Amino acid sequence: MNIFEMLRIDEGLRLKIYKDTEGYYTIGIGHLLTKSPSLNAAKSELDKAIGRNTNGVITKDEAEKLFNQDVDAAVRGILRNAKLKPVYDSLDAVRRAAFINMVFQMGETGVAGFTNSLRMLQQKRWDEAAVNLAKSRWYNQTPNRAKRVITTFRTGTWDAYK
Ligand SMILES: [Cl-]
Ligand SMILES: [Cl-]
């Protein structure tokens, strides 16, 4: 198991514009297109992202291409972030995958907001951090995915995904 396979299980794959759990226009493997309500605004962003007139539909290769960019951007954002970097640096390889997953789903700003849990992860207080991560809107909104991520943090293994 690796970050790519982990996120592909959590996000799924869709080749037609769809609405995410929050109601926003998304395509492929969790690629947010726009927070705007306009499907047109969404198709426009889509075409811009792909470099062609897509009429709202893309191929597998195109979806994967967006996915590769997004994982890269996620990693590079963590490493550029003063609040996140030290956390990431302190973690083992499995837990680093779990942190990237959060960042991909909620943005750098969002994760940077989990101040208390970050301090706990850095100190390697796994159980306590797992309890604190659960007290969040994130966990209440997408409980199955949150539990998987949290278990990865608590255990340091890929069990939740196996
Ligand atoms: Cl893009
Ligand atoms: Cl869920």
Name beta bridge partners: 26. Answer: 18, 32
The stretches of the chain forming alpha helices (DSSP H) are 3-11, 39-50, 60-80, 85-90, 93-112, 115-122, 126-134, 137-141, 143-155
Dihedral angle sign, alpha carbons of residues 22, 28, 30, 34 = negative
- Name the structure determination technique: X-ray
Residue 19 CA to residue 24 CA, distance in Å, equals: 5
Ligand 2 centroid distance, CA of 113 (Å): 21
Counting ligands in written order, the one closest to the CA of 138 is 2
Ligand 1 centroid distance, CA of 99 (Å): 22
Residue 162 CA to residue 160 CA, distance in Å, equals: 6
Residue 32 assigned as binding residue: yes
Task: Give the count of domains, the chain.
Answer: 1
Question: What are the DSSP calls for 104-115, one per residue?
Answer: HHHHHHHHHT-H
Tell me, what CATH number does 153's domain have? 1.10.530.40
Listed resolution, Å: 1.8
Domain residue limits at 2: 1-162
Q: How far is residue 23 CA from its own chain's centroid?
A: 16
Distances (CA, A) of 85 to 37, 66, 108: 34, 24, 11
Torsions phi, psi for 29 (to 5 deg): -100, 70
Question: Between β-strands 25-28 and 31-34, what pairing exists: parallel, antiparallel or unpaired?
Answer: antiparallel
3-state secondary structure of 15: strand
Tokens coding 68: 């590769």
**Nearest residue to 98 via CA among 130, 128, 125:** 130
